[PDB]
Design a protein around this ligand. Structure first.
Ligand SMILES: [Mg+2]
Ligand SMILES: [Mg+2]
Lengths: 295, 289
């Protein structure tokens, strides 16, 4: 049968996804089945399960898979095959024109640093979307293309690093598409006094409070965002409730993953307006689990 | 290693269901896979694929199976086995006490005349339902049970016939359950002047217009009228359905199956210029040679 022998069975990955589907009553939404059999074909990877909370509404059909090897061409190729297979449904149309623009030419795949393929499915077909993430490093030509696709004003350009660029693609099943850039700072970097003091100019002290808890901090820039999204990579999931006063709907998601085996780290995404409110009512929560072979 | 040479292979039954799932992009809703495993174990039967239209919303996860042999105890038992296999998922709550009350005692299975088991699935788990239909004849003790269970109003007793009762059970996956009676008329009845004349009083002339094309007319106890068309080609003339429902009808004009179909809709939809809320039923028989 197989040729490559891992210690990770494909059932382990689908069980982690299945635990998410059971906890939050995720019934089959297109193309969840196609995404799961795509997950079963992957090698070493990290799977992120997520919940998007808007007031008392919960959207939990959010899963991302990060490839944990350096085969960038193959992993991009297989992710796009999933995008093309999902687009085979007659009443679905994916607009890949912005991804085609980014990948056009003699694309140097040796500049790719990280790849994620994901979903965010709703009961509304047109409101569901598929996702592709690509991080590139020291690639001026394609960083320029990505910046132009994002239509970043010179103010947002000052947020972007020149050594790395984290790019996300959204593909709604009704033809809508968007690009997003995620400039980030590591703990050693936003602890630099010459960087943290400038953060005091652009961000409120409420948005700066959880920084001692984080190994990563970033912002999402996209024409599709109502406002810039703040991203916090927490080092310890147990520190979350002391600094992020989420509502009960988001609390059900976080309480479930306080007891799920996997990474101790987590990610929270929310607007700066939510950080200044007394209670977080609109937020994304991300939790992950690693699947790596011991051979 | 099987036993019966006459056993129908389930492949053609499942491809008929598969053509329906493919045509309307049906997700693996629960418990569609269990129902297909149940269909695979059946013998001679009619498989009915259906679509419910609400204006521009289509719900195509609607499949029924009518047993064709007279092994009534066996077919009821296997149907209940499917009902209990579906109920075994922890987040599902199936209440079967209405069916348990009807089948209680020393049930006379020789009085059964027709059995059907089916599904009507939705994206919301609690809104999906499993179905079981039983027709009994000249069974006064159990016809009284079904009458009592339906809270039969006197003016609705005037619709039932003395020696037959078509009873349908609904089992929603959230615990809700229901039972209702289906009075019926055959073509020799609703075309006879003695019955058709007094039908002109209780029914509008628009609801009576499709009767020349029918061999079966019934009411589901707003009341829903059922039309059993003899010929699928006559449908679009007397039923101006919208384009959402036209998508289902156009598909089954091209599919192999029985030339007869069934349309279910309220009397208000008959008096409408276009038909926006309608059920469409198409079938294909599977008999052994
Ligand atoms: Mg985003
Ligand atoms: Mg009904």
């Amino acid at each position: 049968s197989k040729v490559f022998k891992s210690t990770i069975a494909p059932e382990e990955k689908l069980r982690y996804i299945g635990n998410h589907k059971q906890a939050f009553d995720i019934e089959p939404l297109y193309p969840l089945a196609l995404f799961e059999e795509f997950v079963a074909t992957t090698g070493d990877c990290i799977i992120e399960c997520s919940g998007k909370i808007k007031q008392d509404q919960l959207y939990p059909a959010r899963i991302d898979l990060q490839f944990s090897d350096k085969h960038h061409f193959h992993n991009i190729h297989t992710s796009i095959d999933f995008l093309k297979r999902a687009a085979s449904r007659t009443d679905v149309n994916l607009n890949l024109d912005i991804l085609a623009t980014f990948l056009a030419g003699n694309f140097d795949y040796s500049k790719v640093q990280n790849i994620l393929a994901g979903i965010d499915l709703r009961q509304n077909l047109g409101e569901s979307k598929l996702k592709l993430f690509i991080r590139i490093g020291d690639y001026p030509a394609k960083m320029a293309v990505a910046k132009h696709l994002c239509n970043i004003t010179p103010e947002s350009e000052a947020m972007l690093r020149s050594d790395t660029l984290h790019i996300g693609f959204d593909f709604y099943l009704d033809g809508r598409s968007a690009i997003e850039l995620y400039p980030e700072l590591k703990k050693d970097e936003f602890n630099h006094p010459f960087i943290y003091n400038q953060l005091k100019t652009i961000l409120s002290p409420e948005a700066l409070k959880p920084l001692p808890l984080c190994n990563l901090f970033g912002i999402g820039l996209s024409p599709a965002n109502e406002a810039n999204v703040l991203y916090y990579g927490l080092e310890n999931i147990e520190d979350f409730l002391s600094y992020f006063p989420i509502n009960d709907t988001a609390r059900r998601v976080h309480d479930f993953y306080l007891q799920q085996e996997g990474s101790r780290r987590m990610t929270v995404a929310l607007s700066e307006s939510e950080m200044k409110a007394g209670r977080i009512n609109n937020v994304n929560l991300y939790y992950s689990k690693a699947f790596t072979s011991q051979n």
